[PDB]
Amino acid sequence: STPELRRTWLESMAKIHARNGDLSEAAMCYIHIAALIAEYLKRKGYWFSMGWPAFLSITPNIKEEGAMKYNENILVEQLYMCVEFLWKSERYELIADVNKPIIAVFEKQRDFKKLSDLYYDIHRSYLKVAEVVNSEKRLFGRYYRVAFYGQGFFEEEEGKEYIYKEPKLTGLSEISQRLLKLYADKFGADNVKIIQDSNKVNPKDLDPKYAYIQVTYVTPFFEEKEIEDRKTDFEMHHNINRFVFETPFTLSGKKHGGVAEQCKRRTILTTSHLFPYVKKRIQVISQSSTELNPIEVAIDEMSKKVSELNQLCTMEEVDMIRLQLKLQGSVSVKVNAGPMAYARAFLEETNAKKYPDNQVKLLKEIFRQFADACGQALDVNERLIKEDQLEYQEELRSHYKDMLSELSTVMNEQIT
Amino acid sequence: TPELRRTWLESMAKIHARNGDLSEAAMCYIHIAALIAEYLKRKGYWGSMFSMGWPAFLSITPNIKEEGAYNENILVEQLYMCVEFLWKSERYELIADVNKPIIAVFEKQRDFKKLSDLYYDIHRSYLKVAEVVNSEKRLFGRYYRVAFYGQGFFEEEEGKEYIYKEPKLTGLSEISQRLLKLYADKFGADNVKIIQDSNKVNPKDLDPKYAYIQVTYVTPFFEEKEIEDRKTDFEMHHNINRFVFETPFTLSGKKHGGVAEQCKRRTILTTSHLFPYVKKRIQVISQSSTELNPIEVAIDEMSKKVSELNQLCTMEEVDMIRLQLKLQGSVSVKVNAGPMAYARAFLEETNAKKYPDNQVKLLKEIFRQFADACGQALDVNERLIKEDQLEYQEELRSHYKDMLSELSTVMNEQITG
Amino acid sequence: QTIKCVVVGDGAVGKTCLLISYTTNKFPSEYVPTVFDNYAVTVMIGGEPYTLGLFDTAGQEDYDRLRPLSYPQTDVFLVCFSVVSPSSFENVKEKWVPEITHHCPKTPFLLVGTQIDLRDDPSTIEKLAKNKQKPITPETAEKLARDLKAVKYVECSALTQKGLKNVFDEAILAALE
Amino acid sequence: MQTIKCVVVGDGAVGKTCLLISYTTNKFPSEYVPTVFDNYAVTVMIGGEPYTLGLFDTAGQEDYDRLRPLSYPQTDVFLVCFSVVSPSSFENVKEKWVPEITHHCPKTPFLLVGTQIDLRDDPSTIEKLAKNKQKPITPETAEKLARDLKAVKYVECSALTQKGLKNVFDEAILAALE
């Protein structure tokens, strides 16, 4: 909470982040520095002028810089470092709001060449966005809940939950083995275990003679009310603090069971600050969760499959292999239970009496859309296959027709 | 650091003592004793003995685990203070557990007079409990969910949800206005608004021009497994971290509607520490929710009504007025829809086809218990009325049979009593 | 040891919303509907907690036959009216106070003004003006409360929840003489 | 030319479905919600350009032998799986699976995949093979089969510990590109 104590810390993190390739965190460190300098000059009377609120368009996390107990040239130098790392981190959309206050500085000096430079650099920042936005080219990161358990072992990290923002496409394999090696050395490789269960750990269940690291993949979470914003790949990683994951549980008490006993829990973790932050891990401060019963699970995955099929069939250049993957995995399931196990468990007359009418009626309507979407996908495939997939297509149709016949028996309705 | 933690707990205990929050003053002294014990142990000074460190106090409260992150006489002084405030806060049940480590000390010292006195103190606390248990004379407090929204106003409270433990029977408006004026004097009187809706707030729907304080009444929550261990008024306020509240919604997205559309969300909040604690307000760190369909709401309300009518008939001495209140309000409904609205909506042949068989048969069974519970309540009531209520009781019976006449038609089954 | 309190008044004044407001300790936006009639609330009168049984009554004319059967054993009555509905008040005098005084001549009662949030509402004030009407003042209602020998007169709003706690506190003090 | 078709074969109960779900969802096997559909897709980066890796899941049982080769046309790479704690699944690699894919797709590269490698250091597992007079399949004996049968290479993994899992699909992508 001391100006230069906080400032050297942020500059240290900036350099660490730059070496580690956490380039957004580096950009954040510099914008937090610039925010601090601005608040300090404001409090120590200097006459941008609002203090730390000057950079709220960049991130609301800088509110914490106003917990404080340096000239205009160096504030601007902090902003240049910030733009460098926004460029390197591909968060091009923020470059404009960092340069705007610099522009105001140089407007006053009549430096027309500098102004030409600043407007130019906001120009390719938006050109780059025009070239890459929504093209799945930008790898802003993957997110993992990480929790540490073992009061005989862990220092400050004991009993607390983090969201780790990992680079690009880091998979579960890599962050697990990494964290395991890290804490196998400061505590001993014989006394550290990874918790794979994604339920909230209860410490009494754990051997106090061991240290545990729970690792669970999570994804940024938005509800339909927020999808008004969050229209781009950038916005899906810009100032976010909610993260979702699902956990399977049966009615009995197991993780896995049959279609009629399979539930799942939906958990949403909130973080103390927003990503991106001056750190690549942020602590979780709360959890909200809901549950879906077996007919709700079935309703959920059947809707998704209908949307997957329709999406592929309305692409400009339909992706034949990706269409077949989903089509064959809908109409000719051979390893899993197949979508007809849903129809048998929830739509047959005897079984349907055990569930709410509205939910039975919703799952019936989805299956109709499923029939159409498998049909539309079979037609799109026919216009794309060559001679070597004619038998393949004929069996898909044969499997589809056999499925509509059984579906028609079960629903007692003609499904075209 | 132990020193700063101990100075803070000692300050909080005096502040709590000064404001009359005596349960929280008692908890501060048990935490100080936990902190000193762990300190002396980690230095090597030497169930339920101080030697164990903080784990010795785990039966009093699991909250003292956090103390695990100067004489033995001083430890005893902390526990005396706790007992004193345990007495004043009427948490007499706790006194036996706080005295155990004190007893262990004087056992080793062979201070048999002192052991005489401590076992005498425990005897008088259970004598006190025997005189007040579940009389509704003990008022351990009311709980409120309180959450703060205001990115431009609130400091550390911003975006965080707390359970506030309020004194005695503080009602919803009291804490609401108190929270309003408190933050209207730190902000602008025209910039603070109370969020009335109890659904989880999404920040997007808020105007940053004002600060928002969401206030909802909650009660301690236990599942059917727990209810065995939550028999008394003390037990229902002792070492609790789960609170529940219900929110009305309809199938179509409104809040209120007809009994065949009226749903109910049940939210369960969990706090980071257990009440009673060293503070009156504890952060919510967890919430889960679940949705009751209209027939499930019916099941819920009918089982409650059956149960409360049953325990009004099986009381030692029966509250005749409370018995007539509940009974008249079941068999002579004239303002609200009356419990036959549930029967018509869910149990009639054509309507029952829209709901699960198991829930329809369960709602049917509960209604049979409801017929028996009103029957039992009518018989108890006429053992207790004077001549001024014979005509009133007569019209309760006529209504009870007109109800059983309709329930028999709807269930297609003779319902006798 | 439960205090019996019967509440009377012609409908739409807010009797029932008032009672479920304060009993369930909820904002009116948030209360779960109930199929049952009557309410029981626990109250504090200087350290001593009490149980107030609240017997609701349907105010319509069809029930004038049997509604007085709830009157025996009453400890206090509440006669209600809406501060923006004049005939809600005009017929407190014409029908309600004669009826409850006839059946229980020695039981105390209070005059209660409800929906006070809508007397300081602009839309509501003009809807009254077109009918050649204006909201009833406290003073005119306190005039009347003295006229017919009520204990006192109180005002409440379940939307504000301001003044409502006072209504029931005064009811209990009345039932304790 | 946006999507890699990879087809997975092997006997039942070697863990192939469980292998594909964990890599495709980035979850541990116990934590995925069971699905009633077949096949899995995951985006994979080639030189900074986004590709779909399509994973086609096949049933290894005899009842499926007639229709399974209809999925082989257009395949870019095969994963031939066996569990290292099931010598029968290992022998059927030589005696069933490699011949079947060789016959329908003789020019299509395939990888030999050992699964369930965590069970190689399991007492109950190593003992349960002792009572059956069998021993677990060592990595060295599995690389010799890979060279004999003209496999592009051998890879082991465990879906439970995630050890070696990522490298299997790294190796599969590189073979799928030719």
Ligand SMILES: Nc1nc2c(ncn2[C@@H]2O[C@H](COP(=O)(O)OP(=O)(O)O)[C@@H](O)[C@H]2O)c(=O)[nH]1
């Ligand atoms: N604005 C406002 N409306 C109210 C209040 N109390 C009740 N109401 C409304 O008045 C209507 C009828 O009131 P009700 O509770 O049925 O009173 P009753 O008919 O005499 O039992 C309902 O639609 C309520 O929402 C209040 O304090 N303020």
Ligand SMILES: Nc1nc2c(ncn2[C@@H]2O[C@H](COP(=O)(O)OP(=O)(O)O)[C@@H](O)[C@H]2O)c(=O)[nH]1
């Ligand atoms: N210990 C262990 N068990 C596994 C592994 N992979 C799969 N299993 C289990 O092996 C059983 C069969 O695997 P399954 O997914 O059906 O493989 P498939 O029959 O080839 O599709 C299941 O009970 C899995 O939990 C692994 O890596 N380690």
